Design a protein around this ligand. Structure first.
Ligand SMILES: NC[C@@H]1O[C@H](O[C@H]2[C@@H](O)[C@H](O[C@@H]3[C@@H](O)[C@H](N)C[C@H](N)[C@H]3O[C@H]3O[C@H](CO)[C@@H](O)[C@H](O)[C@H]3N)O[C@@H]2CO)[C@H](N)[C@@H](O)[C@@H]1O
Ligand SMILES: NC[C@@H]1O[C@H](O[C@H]2[C@@H](O)[C@H](O[C@@H]3[C@@H](O)[C@H](N)C[C@H](N)[C@H]3O[C@H]3O[C@H](CO)[C@@H](O)[C@H](O)[C@H]3N)O[C@@H]2CO)[C@H](N)[C@@H](O)[C@@H]1O
Ligand SMILES: NC[C@@H]1O[C@H](O[C@H]2[C@@H](O)[C@H](O[C@@H]3[C@@H](O)[C@H](N)C[C@H](N)[C@H]3O[C@H]3O[C@H](CO)[C@@H](O)[C@H](O)[C@H]3N)O[C@@H]2CO)[C@H](N)[C@@H](O)[C@@H]1O
Ligand SMILES: [Mg+2]
Ligand SMILES: [Mg+2]
Ligand SMILES: [Mg+2]
Ligand SMILES: [Mg+2]
Length: 190
RNA sequence: GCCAGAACCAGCCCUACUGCAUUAUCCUGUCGGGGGUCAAAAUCCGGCGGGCAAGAAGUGCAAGAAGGGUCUUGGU
RNA sequence: ACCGGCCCUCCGUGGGUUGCGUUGGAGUGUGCCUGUUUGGACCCGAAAGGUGGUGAACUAUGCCUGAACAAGGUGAAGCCCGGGGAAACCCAGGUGGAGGCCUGUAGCGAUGCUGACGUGCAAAUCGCUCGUAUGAUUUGGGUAUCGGAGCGAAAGACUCAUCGAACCACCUAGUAGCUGGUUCACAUCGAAGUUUCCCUCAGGAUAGCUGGUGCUAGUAGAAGUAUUGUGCGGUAAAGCAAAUGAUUAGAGGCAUUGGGACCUAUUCUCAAACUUUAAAUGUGCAAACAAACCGGCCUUAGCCAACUGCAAGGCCGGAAAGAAAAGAAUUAGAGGCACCAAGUGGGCCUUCUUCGGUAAGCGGAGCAGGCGAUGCGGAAUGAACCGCUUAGGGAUAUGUGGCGUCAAAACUUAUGGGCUCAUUCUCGAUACGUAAAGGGUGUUGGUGGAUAUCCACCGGCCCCGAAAAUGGAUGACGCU
RNA sequence: AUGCAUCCAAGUGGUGUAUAUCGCAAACUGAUUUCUGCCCAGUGCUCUGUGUCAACGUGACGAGAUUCACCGACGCGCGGGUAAACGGCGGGAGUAACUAUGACUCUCUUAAGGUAGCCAAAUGCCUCGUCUUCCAAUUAGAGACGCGCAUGAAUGGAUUAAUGAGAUUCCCUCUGUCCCGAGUUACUAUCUAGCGAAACGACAGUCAAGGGAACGGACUUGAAGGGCUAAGCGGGGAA
RNA sequence: GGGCGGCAUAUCUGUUACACGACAACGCAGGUGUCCUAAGGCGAGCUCAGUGGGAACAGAAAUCUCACGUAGAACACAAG
RNA sequence: GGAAAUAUGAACAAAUCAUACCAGAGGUGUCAGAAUAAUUACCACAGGGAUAACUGGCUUGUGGCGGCCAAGCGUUCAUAGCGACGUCGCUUUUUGAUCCUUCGAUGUCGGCUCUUCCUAACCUAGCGCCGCAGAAGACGCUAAGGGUUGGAUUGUUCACCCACUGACAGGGAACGUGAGCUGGGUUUAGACCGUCGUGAGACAGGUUGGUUUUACCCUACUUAGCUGGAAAUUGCGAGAA
RNA sequence: UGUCGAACGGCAAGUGCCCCGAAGCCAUCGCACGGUGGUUCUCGGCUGAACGCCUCUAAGCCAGAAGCCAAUCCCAAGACCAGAUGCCCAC
RNA sequence: GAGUACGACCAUACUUGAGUGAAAACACCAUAUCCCGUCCGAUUUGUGAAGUUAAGCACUCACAGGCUCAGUUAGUACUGAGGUCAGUGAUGACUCGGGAACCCUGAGUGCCGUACUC
């Protein structure tokens, strides 16, 4: 039985990653950071729905999996597996310790958490404009696996790109837009 | 050389009596366009004609040489 | 420059030093306080160590000579008679009185009640029960063995209520960095829990803070502050599209390969021990009176090929907003020395930064301020919070906090606006200061959509979530 | 005995020794019965005598002191003996015609690898071992089995009749131990006459909550409280 | 708490450490008691790590050659 | 005796020998530098709450008890009853951590006795709801008024079975309660065993034997007496349910 | 059993012992007795809107737990009773 | 308007790829008897002067990479002082001050000194 998340919710220490100094750190519980059609293109899924953190806290890697194993569930239950793409924009890079205030008290690594901030995006699921209301409900359920307070906002940008939903058309049709991968870059003069 | 009361000096502490500037996104006058009403006055917006809203403003600064205290000091 | 020591040398009108040296003496005797030191050493206090004597009337053991041990049971050897047998020998009835034998008095012990008593009858006793009671038995008198020794059927037991080293006197008022105590008043000043070293960590010495004495030409060689000029920095932030360390993912480069390697541009996400860049807060120096500034002169075995240049120490003369104007400083700003010596060297709390920890009224740091050591006015109460800091008193006015009663003040103020209803720890209510996720067609505002009605969101108060051991707490009553 | 152990400051000193190996002195174990296994490497003792070990003695250099050289015994070195001296007495891996099991084999290591026995024993961590018995039910008891944390042979092993104020368990009788208490007696307490202390004692003495050196008799806010007595009693006074 | 354990008992680089300096903990990450007649001193010449194109035996790796190569090498050692 | 020859052994002089002055080396790792093994359960002294073992405090990892989300379980189905992955918490009957209070002493376990409290309700009173036909029962609500046993083994809290019952709920009060008891157990001195130690001895290993002292004081509580006082003693201070 | 010489009467043995024993005390070891009203929680409802219908709730009502509060029961005026009374005194 | 030698700052000067280059000078270039040094006349040393601007050098040109400089990001991040501020808290705003960084965008792409020379 692991120690509860009540013990590690607050950013009380400096960031303590895996380096050439701390070398017994376990494998974090989240391994897949993208669910859905990650092979897909930019103009496949226009809309973007975020899960933004309203707290300065540490989310454990055990909660990043629990929020992602369950957001995948309600999507394939109430849609297909080929309409969404939920990127998890938090990575467990800070390593927690356990003393398993006494002589020789500096702990050993047992778990890894994500030091998240105010306004830092936690989840991001780009979907189609048809199947939007199934995505507000998959992300309402996924933030229950999260500590702290989160909001589910509607992003004004076209998917995972840095270009607006107002100003995406006549920018691929003006030809000025470099679509590489899952993101875009406005071509400028060199 | 005790206890009270008033009086009057001086000192000090209170509170009455107020001027200089400032108004304008404002005052007033009528023709509009707007309103509502039984009809129409108003709220509201706009033309150019006048302006001082005059213990008029709760806006800036105030220097206006007293009636009351003084078992809140000293004196005769 | 000279004196002494030690040297170097190019041998000097030369270098380097060292002394508790010299450069027109400051000693010395005494009185008195202070401090260090040693003596009983401010007072009282160990466990101990040593010397020499007294004890075997308690009790441990040996020896000499005396004394003591009811009444029962069991019944050993030997002895007598009978019987069986060929013999070897067996079998029976008595007799007898053996034993570290048995029951049980006295005596000698002391098992259980964990009885009584437990400021007793008693510094070990009383009661009943129990062990033994012809033996390694009990006991008198006499004798013999003792203090690092005696004696011990051995328990470190006993040696005159004293024993894992007796008792007496002494050395000895042993020594204590440890505990306790330390006797009049007022006045003037007033700390430290930190540094370094220590067989040091409950102690010291040392520097600091502190007092006393002063000395020296009362603004001087001043400053926990600014301003202007000129230096130093790598923390916060930023970045990973820049090196290093991590770390997701898609895009194809096509021949660069094997059952994403590889390459090129991007990307999601990070770094106390990473960094291109880089703050705020800090930190160094300068800002005209022994000083720099301006034009010659003297000197030097300094430098340079040389001096007319350079470097150095003087000399002579000059100028000097005594530092302008540009926001262009301010000062309850006498500067500089020295002697002597206390107490302290357990700290603790807090805003902020921070480390270990799940956490802690936890442990450890940084800058400052506090308590310690300090009340007073407030937070009902509280070392540390808020206000304020303190001679003995008045008057006025405040601060923090208050104005329904307790309790001074709105004798429950306004001729201000909203919000709130809560039915067994009972809505709520003075910061520090000790319930959450989540939910509500309770009410009250907002935002964005739609056809007077719906829909998604967000806020305020209120309710649910919300369960402990004396009766109970916004401080009490109460207040709507 | 020209001794052994030993007193002893000392001597022609003292004890066992008034003795004389059927004795005296020093140890161990603990009646009988039955046995007492292996280990002499370690550490002790002990025995037979050429490395090294002091003083003395010897010789030499030198003016001599000082040096140097040689000789130099016990004792350790070297070799034996000794366990009823102190003590000690192993680890892996495979193997039988069903499985298991392992007579069997292999390997490593030792001074020797624990023999006869005994056992969850007063010695067993796991452990309230497992099996059987005893009870309606037993972490207890007895008998077993031993994979013995860590049993084991005069550091004595095993066993035993008789004996024990020894430790344990069951059964019978028995009962106020209990269900569940009652009632009587003597002596107290209690009341009087006479007599008359001690322990103790800052001051004192009602509580709830709050705070506080984080369990208040005193402080804060509440709740009680007329004074003074006699017998009790054991919650507080961190008595 | 003391004991065992350890060394935080003399000492070095990074970090903690809060952009001067100074700053604690049985705080974090590692070192130290040695080593060298050259691994010291100096002068000259040279360029390293690595990758790419090539050359009998000869391959991913032997050695020759060329190019690129701000140090990605090296400087006895821990680190800077 | 100087610019220049090292100096002393103090009545002198020579030669030996020692010494001195200068610069190193041989070493103190506890590194500003004494030359150091245990044991004590036979124990002592001065102290320390500067510091441990018992309670109290803080914390709550750990131990107990929940809610929120809903992948799943339930033939069907998220929630009758459950509910992973997460997550937010309550609790102080566990334990750890700490070291605040006590070392010129707070008697350190469990029984026995007795009273009270709390609710997170086992039985009893009303209920709602079920994958509730009845009968038994799951879950929940208001409620702590009342009740909650007899035993075998164990020193036990605990555990474990036997049996009765409507039911044999869980806790608090200095782990309630030793001038209330008991003393089984921990927790001395004796002795035995095993393992350890060369030994003296050691042992959160087993075994056996091992003084439980004081109330007459203040309060509290239980009963038992006496006796004033409305300005709660006085003012004469005048209030009639 | 001892002892007043024996009988009689007794006495001693901390009440010698044995049997029966009044009275008193006492046993779940016997016997008798142990009662009413409301309030309102959960809850189920009634009217009834907000919200032209619906709805236990928002106003308002109903029924209602071994809880709670009274009645009964026990102490009782320091709860200071001009509650009532008997008899004396004093105004 | 340029060269060469010594240079100061040390990319606005570097890197890559093209283009152009009067004179003179630098430079490739020729060579090995001496001086000298190599496995090698490659480098290096000496001695030269037939050849060529092919290359170095110089200059010019890239919606070049870089570098440099403003601007933007942005009064944003962060931070000094304050509160009986708000919030269960995490933290946030306010008040008095200071005030970034990358991305991005624009610009231009060496400059000054001595001696000798065309
Ligand atoms: N010298 C006298 C002898 O006594 C003899 O008398 C003896 C016999 O009669 C008889 O002897 C008996 C006998 O009965 C029988 N057969 C044999 C038995 N052993 C004997 O028994 C004898 O000896 C035994 C010992 O064993 C004893 O115990 C006992 O005293 C005695 N009776 O007992 C007598 C001994 O006491 C004869 N008369 C005879 O031979 C002769 O006279
Ligand atoms: N010790 C070495 C010599 O022995 C000698 O004495 C020796 C003998 O003379 C003497 O032995 C004699 C014995 O022989 C003769 N029969 C009579 C005498 N009683 C013994 O003496 C004995 O008695 C007493 C015990 O009380 C012991 O102390 C002693 O040792 C013992 N040996 O015992 C000694 C043995 O060593 C001398 N005393 C003297 O020279 C020296 O001591
Ligand atoms: N003489 C010795 C010989 O070896 C044998 O000795 C054997 C055992 O005694 C001994 O083994 C041990 C022993 O060391 C230890 N001390 C006791 C243990 N119980 C024995 O265990 C032996 O006995 C038990 C029970 O009988 C068996 O179940 C077991 O299998 C066996 N190993 O080692 C040997 C292994 O079997 C015989 N006992 C003996 O009869 C034979 O003669
Ligand atoms: Mg007998
Ligand atoms: Mg002993
Ligand atoms: Mg103060
Ligand atoms: Mg006996």
């Amino acid at each position: 039985a692991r120690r509860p998340s009540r013990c590690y919710r607050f950013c009380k220490n400096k960031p303590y990653p895996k380096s050439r100094f701390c070398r017994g750190v376990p494998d974090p519980k989240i391994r897949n950071f993208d669910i859905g059609r990650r092979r897909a293109t930019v103009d496949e899924f226009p809309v973007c729905i975020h899960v933004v953190s309203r707290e300065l806290e540490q989310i454990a890697s055990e909660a990043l999996e629990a929020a992602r194993i369950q957001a995948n569930k309600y999507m394939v239950k109430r849609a297909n597996k080929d309409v969404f793409h939920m990127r998890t924009r938090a990575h467990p890079f800070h390593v927690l310790r356990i003393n398993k205030g006494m002589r020789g008290a500096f702990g050993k690594p047992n778990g890894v958490c994500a030091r998240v901030r105010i306004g830092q995006i936690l989840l991001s699921m780009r979907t189609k404009e048809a199947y939007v209301p199934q995505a507000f409900e998959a992300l309402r359920r996924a933030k229950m696996k999260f500590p702290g307070r989160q909001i589910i906002v509607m992003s004004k940008y076209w998917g995972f790109t840095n270009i607006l939903r107002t100003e995406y058309e006549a920018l691929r049709d003006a030809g000025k837009l470099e679509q590489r991968g899952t993101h875009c870059k406005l071509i400028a003069p060199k």
